[PDB]
């Protein structure tokens with residue numbers, strides 16, 4: 001199992017930051033923690049690296065698990081975040097943008113992410 005850390009990021013319009021990976025799936029931004037890095041710090045770094053968005057962690061969410069196409073089981077720890085700015089897709093792109101809850105429900109490719117989206121929306125203050 002390999003750890004992961006990501007963020008469910010929201011802007012003022014309460015839109016969520018989504019990315020389209022190599023295999024064509026829309027997901028939340030996340031990546032591998034660096035040695036000595038906490039998951040929260042790792043999550044903030046991964047968001048900035050992959051989208052150029054500077055975000056603030058509001059509170060922790062919960063981890064999701066799954067086995068990727070390479071046979072590696074991943075445990076990704078998530079954090080609710082706040083951020084702004086036009087996303088800048090990284091050279092591992094194909095897609096990115098801010099989406100409303102309803103649009104995100106139609107893009108997110110996995111059950112774990114759809115579930116995570118709702119729980120995040122509920123804890124996101126007004």
Ligand SMILES: Nc1ncnc2c1ncn2[C@@H]1O[C@H](COP(=O)(O)OP(=O)(O)OP(=O)(O)O)[C@@H](O)[C@H]1O
Nearest residue numbers: 021023025031032065066067068069074110112113
């Ligand atoms: N919740 C999920 N359930 C099932 N499959 C998923 C889930 N999330 C992602 N995947 C699949 O696994 C892939 C992502 O795996 P993973 O996060 O390990 O790789 P990565 O982020 O592309 O690269 P890396 O982790 O090596 O830096 C997706 O491209 C997709 O095919």
Ligand SMILES: [Mg+2]
Nearest residue numbers: 031032033046
């Ligand atoms: Mg990384």
